[PDB]
Amino acid sequence: GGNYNYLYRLFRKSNLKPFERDISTEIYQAGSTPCNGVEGFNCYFPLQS
Amino acid sequence: IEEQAKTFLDKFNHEAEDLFYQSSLASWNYNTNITEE
């Protein structure tokens, strides 16, 4: 049925420094636009499973 | 802009591969063992 408890990050502003760690979940940001916390056109969560 | 389309497809390429899997795995269980359930 699928083990959906193992996630990974697939969007970030900039690549990590070595041995750096980032557990935030603040929404992403597509083309120029606000998007005050809410998916939609060009914008969406940063974690997949 | 074009870089917005690349980030659109990556979101697509991850959600589709799992939803196509289960939708084709359930078509296997019907094809090799027929019930109506």
Ligand SMILES: *[C@@H]1O[C@H](CO)[C@@H](O[C@@H]2O[C@H](CO)[C@@H](O)[C@H](O)[C@H]2NC(C)=O)[C@H](O)[C@H]1NC(C)=O
């Ligand atoms: C066809 O497959 C289904 C499901 O894969 C089988 O139905 C039940 O499967 C569960 C497993 O989750 C068993 O615990 C039940 O005992 C099964 N039902 C019955 C009536 O045995 C079904 O058995 C398969 N078809 C055949 C002919 O074995």
